[PDB]
Design an enzyme around this catalytic site. Structure first.
Site, PDB file in Angstrom:
ATOM      1  N   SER A   2       0.811  -1.200   0.000  1.00 43.86           N
ATOM      2  CA  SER A   2       0.000   0.000   0.000  1.00 43.86           C
ATOM      3  C   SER A   2       0.832   1.231   0.000  1.00 43.86           C
ATOM      4  O   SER A   2       1.675   1.382   0.833  1.00 43.86           O
ATOM      5  CB  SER A   2      -0.916   0.051   1.231  1.00 43.86           C
ATOM      6  OG  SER A   2      -1.714   1.213   1.194  1.00 43.86           O
ATOM      7  N   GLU A  58     -10.511   4.112   1.686  1.00 44.06           N
ATOM      8  CA  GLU A  58      -9.999   2.997   2.457  1.00 44.06           C
ATOM      9  C   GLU A  58     -10.907   2.762   3.671  1.00 44.06           C
ATOM     10  O   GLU A  58     -11.028   3.657   4.514  1.00 44.06           O
ATOM     11  CB  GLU A  58      -8.574   3.260   2.906  1.00 44.06           C
ATOM     12  CG  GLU A  58      -7.896   2.059   3.562  1.00 44.06           C
ATOM     13  CD  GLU A  58      -6.355   2.108   3.594  1.00 44.06           C
ATOM     14  OE1 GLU A  58      -5.732   2.358   4.660  1.00 44.06           O
ATOM     15  OE2 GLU A  58      -5.744   1.829   2.541  1.00 44.06           O
TER      16      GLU A  58
END
Length: 722
Positions: A206, A431
């Site tokens: 990420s 997210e």
């Protein structure tokens, strides 16, 4: 309303665990005030009496498969989903317009669609003339730079691993072929993943920050070089990690190459030896070799001219930070503390960094206050000293990260004067995990903010379309995110409170939660409190509703670095780098929330001074499989990209847009020669005024008719009936 579309032999979409939606025909005609629906996929779909809501209708074939998602008549999730699926699987098309947006599904394989032949097909063309392609978006950016005398930005959002680095490379391959940047910028990627990416519970790689790369052009509009800016860095990560997560990749790289001859001196243990890198309880990413990944990072440094000396400096600073995290404190009492004597962590800190154990040991445990009278030093609790240790670490890291960016930038900069630029932004999208904390709260805030600026651009352009077409432009509605953003960032909002509480000697996570309730609950619709908890809040974000656990918020937000702590380091000598990092006092009183807001308004300013174009990158599956489409993952991605909201907004105005000709030439067969006048544009008005009786299902403009959702599918149905 009537709803004479739920007839018999009409397709609809109903829900499905494995595929999300199943296509379902009709058997019985739906009767008004019914409660059933006979279907041969064979069942009787039963709607709920209160909702009395019918499953979304399916689109007619002439529209299925279209290059632009907002040319579907029924704009909804199934249609979008179905449309993207057949193009990707049946036809191998990764690119699909969503109005002015480019959707890019990662195919997890190399496609022969980026050669000079294709590039050439796209230079000169206008947007939409041709099939959707990243090249089209580059063309627009490049064309408009030249004609408007104005810098551009291509924003590329989505989860990392979704194909954003591919999109940026081919914007660069394209720019460099219609005018050696690309090889140099891609060679930098591993430097930038090592310091800015990190494993989380849901992505092994990420990216935790925004990367903007300004591609520079001269007066003859040729490429001369590149300049990278960065924003939004997750500083929290340097000193805290949730279960199952890791600190930045570079820390782990270093500790799995501890035994290397030239890192003997850094006296590095393995990653479970360090506070700053073991909290997640998972130092190795399955299938990832951290020691091999370290050689790529140095090779990358070498390739952008970072000397073996400066490179060794980088890892000296980083071992520094790791060891610093292990400095332990013993409190003498609630108000003071000390470092045990002959204490290994700080011995090693201080040897590496090149400072005096005792002067460090002192400003780790004391604090210099200043007033107009004069100044005075006081002791400070074990707690305030953890917070200061951590702040220092975060501050070292942040400035090492800026150091490494400057020096990439030196390899990328050109001497030739620069007249303009096109910046590619590599930002994340939404997210949400099962557990959400400060970090997600920051990503989501940035996302409301990038969504607002997208909505306002679309809305400008719609207003402009309407003026040209001579429809009153005030008829366009706006779907405004400013209330959610104020709830987050305005006086008395979530971040302002978090700041206030952090300054309160007694303030904690639970007492901040309470101020959130007493300030916003029942007073702001975007703010819910879970019925079963006192430690969590909910925000109605544009894309989705998100629950945040308050645990950790107050500690993560604190970020007060002590000047005495810095100046000690700012004065090393056995080490050229460290003093370079720090070449004021208000800037580091600032919390992480507050810096984040500054970085974010910096980013918006940057983008607002430019003409934006937009690319949304999605992952179709969870295993890097070639051309494979998982419906559950697709919907989640399109949602977290804003594409589902983009499409909803679209679906509430006049999305379909036919020119008078396109219309006459499709629906000639529907009129009788009697009503066919010599004025084409006027025939259509009359003809359509009969075919659809309600007048506000369409607006007539200069050259196009604008239709409400479903009106083209209605037309197309009575073209079949006949």
């Amino acid at each position: 309303a009537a709803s004479e579309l739920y007839t018999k032999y009409a397709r609809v979409w109903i829900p499905d665990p494995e595929e999300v939606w199943k296509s379902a025909e009709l058997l019985k005609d739906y009767k008004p005030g019914d409660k059933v629906l006979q279907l041969r996929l064979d069942l009787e779909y039963c709607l709920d009496p209160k909702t009395k809501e019918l499953p979304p209708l399916r689109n007619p074939d002439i529209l299925v498969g279209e290059n632009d998602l907002t040319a579907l008549s029924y704009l909804h999730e199934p249609a979008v989903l179905h449309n993207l699926k057949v193009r990707f699987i049946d036809s191998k098309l990764i690119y699909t317009y969503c109005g002015i947006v480019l959707v890019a599904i990662n195919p997890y394989e190399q496609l022969p669609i980026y050669g000079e032949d294709i590039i050439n097909a796209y230079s000169g063309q206008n947007m939409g003339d041709m099939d959707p392609h990243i090249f089209a978006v580059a063309e627009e950016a490049y064309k408009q730079m030249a004609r408007d005398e104005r810098n551009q930005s291509i924003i590329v959002s989505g989860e990392s691993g979704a194909g954003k680095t591919v999109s940026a490379k081919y914007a660069m391959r394209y720019f460099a072929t219609v005018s050696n940047v690309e090889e140099k910028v891609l060679a930098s990627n591993p430097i930038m993943e090592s310091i800015g990416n990190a494993k989380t519970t849901r992505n092994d790689n990420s990216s935790r920050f925004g990367k903007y790369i300004e591609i520079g052009f001269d007066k003859r509009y040729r490429i001369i070089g590149a300049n990278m800016r960065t924003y939004l860095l997750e500083k929290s990560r340097v000193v805290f990690q949730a279960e199952e997560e890791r600190n930045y990749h570079i820390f782990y790289q270093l500790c799995a190459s501890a035994a290397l001859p030239e890192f003997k001196t850094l006296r590095l243990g393995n990653a479970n030896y360090f506070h700053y890198t073991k909290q997640g309880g998972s130092p190795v990413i399955d299938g990832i070799d951290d020691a091999k990944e370290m050689v790529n990072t140095r090779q990358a440094c070498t390739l952008l001219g970072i000397s073996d000396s400066y490179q060794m400096g980088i890892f000296r600073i980083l071992a520094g930070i790791l060891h610093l995290g292990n400095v332990e404190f013993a409190s003498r009492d609630s108000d003071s503390c000390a470092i045990p004597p002959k204490h290994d962590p700080l011995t090693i800190f201080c040897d590496l960094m090149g400072v005096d154990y005792e002067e460090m040991a002192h400003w780790l445990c004391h604090r210099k206050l200043a007033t107009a009278t004069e100044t005075y030093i006081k002791p400070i609790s074990k707690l305030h000293a953890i917070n200061a240790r951590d702040a220092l670490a975060k501050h070292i890291y942040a400035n090492l990260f800026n150091w490494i960016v400057d020096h990439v930038n030196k390899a990328l900069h050109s001497t030739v004067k620069q007249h303009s630029f096109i910046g590619v932004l590599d930002i994340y999208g939404f997210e949400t995990f099962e557990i959400n904390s400060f970090e997600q709260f920051c990503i989501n805030y940035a996302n409301e903010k990038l969504q607002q600026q997208f909505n306002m651009h679309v809305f400008k352009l719609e207003q402009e379309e309407y003026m040209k077409e001579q429809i009153p432009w005030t008829l366009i509605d706006f779907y405004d995110n400013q209330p959610c953003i104020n709830l987050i960032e305005a006086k008395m909002g979530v971040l302002d409170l978090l700041d206030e509480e952090c300054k309160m000697p007694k303030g904690s996570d639970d007492t901040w939660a309470q101020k959130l309730y007493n300030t916003h609950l029942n007073k702001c619709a975007l703010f819910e409190k879970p019925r079963l908890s006192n430690k969590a809040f909910i925000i109605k974000h544009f894309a989705d509703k998100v629950e945040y656990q308050c645990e950790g918020f107050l500690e993560k937000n604190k970020d007060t670095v002590y000047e005495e702590q810095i100046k000690v380091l700012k004065s090393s000598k056995k080490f050229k780098l460290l003093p370079e990092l720090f070449q004021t006092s208000k800037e580091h009183k600032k919390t992480v929330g507050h810096q984040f807001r500054n970085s974010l308004h910096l980013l918006m300013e940057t983008l607002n001074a430019t003409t934006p174009h937009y690319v949304r990158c999605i992952k179709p599956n969870d295993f890097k499989f070639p051309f494979t489409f998982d419906e559950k993952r697709a919907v989640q991605q399109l949602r977290a990209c804003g594409v589902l909201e983009t499409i909803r907004i679209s679906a509430a105005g006049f999305p379909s847009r036919w020119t008078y000709q396109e219309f006459f030439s499709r629906y000639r067969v529907l009129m009788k020669q009697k009503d066919v006048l010599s004025d084409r544009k006027q025939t259509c008005k009359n003809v359509l005024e009969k075919l659809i009786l309600d007048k506000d299902k369409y607006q007539f403009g200069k050259t196009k008719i604008f239709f409400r959702a479903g009106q083209v599918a209605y037309l197309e149905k009575i073209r079949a009936d006949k």
